[PDB]
Amino acid sequence: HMSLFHLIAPSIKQHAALRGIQRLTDAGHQVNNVEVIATETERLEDLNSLARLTTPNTIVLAVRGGYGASRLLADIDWQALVARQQHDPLLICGHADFTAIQCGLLAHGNVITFSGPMLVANFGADELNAFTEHHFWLALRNETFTIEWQGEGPTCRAEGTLWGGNLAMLISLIGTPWMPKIENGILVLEDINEHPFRVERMLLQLYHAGILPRQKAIILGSFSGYNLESVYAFLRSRLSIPLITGLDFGHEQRTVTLPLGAHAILNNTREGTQLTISGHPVLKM
Amino acid sequence: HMSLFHLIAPSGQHAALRGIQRLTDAGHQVNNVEVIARRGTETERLEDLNSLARLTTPNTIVLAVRGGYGASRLLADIDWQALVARQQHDPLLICGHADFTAIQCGLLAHGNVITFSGPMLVANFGADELNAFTEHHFWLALRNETFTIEWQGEGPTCRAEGTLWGGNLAMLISLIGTPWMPKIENGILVLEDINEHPFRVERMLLQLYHAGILPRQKAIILGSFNLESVYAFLRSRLSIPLITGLDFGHEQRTVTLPLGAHAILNNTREGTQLTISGHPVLKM
């Protein structure tokens, strides 16, 4: 599906950015704004100017998700972005720090965007990961699709709004206007950076702030004698809802793509785990 | 002066025995020397804390051993009311930092119970040398009903008074949205952190900003943590003074602050003073 990409940089790896552009263009995609690989106001305008980006059915790809989004949140024109996304929505995709903007979008107007690969980390990596490439196009091209993996957890079925992304970024939003108030959801979390104790401290905060227990289920993506198993065990000891581990999701070279704010059905059985996702915007045919 | 220290280890060994040795050689005494044995379980780390409600020897200094991870696990099981009740008469003088901030905060949230953010057994008393600055500032706070810390702080020249609070930034962040967040406004909030990358410091400071915590204080002091863009950015969002350069936190130089005490911040051109009162002291 040959597509139009529009690069945004709300958050040094220019060679990998070019390698990503070259791969996309070589494969017959077009890049709307190649010129912007040559400050606050300029990073801010990358986002606010999306409300005036009216190219048809466009994939808006975050270039990198190192830090910077947090500075922007109070100056983003949320209403104009939410208005934009009411018709021929941009298909907005990124991860890591980009999670904060994604959550902001959800909180102001249930705008669905894709927690998934970025130009530098994924598309311009030394090897393009096929698993990641597959799941990206899988999500953007199919109005209903299913992710399968060998998850670890109780056998169960839950259905609700899919949300989450990067754990630290989601924590950074508690207390603020940009925390989405989603209940009875399937909450998917990743943070491949952090020390286990920090992961635990953050999961606990989600617990004691009342976010985790109000969901229908919790899925943990990529994270890497006190280790991560102790953290899962302790969290499970607090929760009366299923917590499933083992999804390839986050900043590993393997990551699925997840439409935050879409509808999902989680089904975990002895045979393995399925997540069926629908309602997100797709490439049009 | 010569004191009784009672050790607690709700969080987290050579340096620990060296710290005990330094305290006992100076003529202090140390109870609960057995918390350096367990490697312990939730239940016992819990009991370190809950049993303080029945430690009634007066003028006792409860000293946290280390402030690595652990407290977060305990907060929902701590008998906060029994601790608040204990501290209304001949209160314990409870001192720690780092992870210990969370307990300190829970105490504030439950009863405006003052405690001290300052040295701990392993990091401070058991280091290669006992740092004289830190030593002086610990005893200054515990012995004097009114005392004044001075330093060459950087910020606007200003005078502000309110409830002093804060401690470790990440730990205070961990409490937003939970029952253990102190509800202090019009205060003097002092923050420090260790081994945080600048961008992580910024994210945390921004969260305190956007949750409405920073702008509701009278002032913000930054302790020990390149972060100049981080100070510049937060200053660009705040309408209240933000003073840097205090020696507070996890470096060998740290002051000791009585969280929940009354403070007057005075920053001038010739330097910064923080005048603190209302906290419990060693009584003679």
UniProtKB/Swiss-Prot annotation, chain A:
Q: Does the keyword Cytoplasm apply?
A: yes
Phenotypic effect of disruption: Bacteriolysis during the stationary growth phase. Cells lacking this gene also accumulate UDP-MurNAc-tetrapeptide, an unusual compound that normally is not present at significant levels in E.coli cells.
Give the UniProt record's GO annotations in the biological process aspect.
cell wall organization; peptidoglycan biosynthetic process; peptidoglycan turnover; proteolysis; regulation of cell shape
User: Which ranges does the record mark as transmembrane?
Assistant: none
SUPFAM superfamilies reported for this sequence: Class I glutamine amidotransferase-like, LD-carboxypeptidase A C-terminal domain-like
Checking InterPro entries in the record gives: Carboxypeptidase_A_C_sf, Class_I_gatase-like, LdcA_N, Peptidase_S66_N, Peptidase_S66C, S66_fam
Q: How is its activity regulated?
A: Inhibited by beta-lactams containing a D-amino acid side chain.
**Top enzyme category:** hydrolase
Mainly resides where? cytoplasm
One cellular-component annotation, GO:
cytosol
Q: In which pathway does it act?
A: Cell wall biogenesis; peptidoglycan recycling
Q: Which UniProt keywords apply?
A: Carboxypeptidase, Cell shape, Cell wall biogenesis/degradation, Cytoplasm, Hydrolase, Peptidoglycan synthesis, Protease, Serine protease
CDD domains according to UniProt? Peptidase_S66 (cd07025)
Q: Where in the cell is it found?
A: Cytoplasm
Catalytic residues at A96 (nucleophile), E190 (charge relay system), H251 (charge relay system)
Biological role: Releases the terminal D-alanine residue from the cytoplasmic tetrapeptide recycling product L-Ala-gamma-D-Glu-meso-Dap-D-Ala. To a lesser extent, can also cleave D-Ala from murein derivatives containing the tetrapeptide, i.e. MurNAc-tetrapeptide, UDP-MurNAc-tetrapeptide, GlcNAc-MurNAc-tetrapeptide, and GlcNAc-anhMurNAc-tetrapeptide. Does not act on murein sacculi or cross-linked muropeptides. The tripeptides produced by the LcdA reaction can then be reused as peptidoglycan building blocks; LcdA is thereby involved in murein recycling. Is also essential for viability during stationary phase.
User: What family does the entry list?
Assistant: Belongs to the peptidase S66 family.
| Protein name in the entry | Murein tetrapeptide carboxypeptidase
| Source organism of the structure | Escherichia coli (strain K12)
Q: Which gene encodes it?
A: ldcA
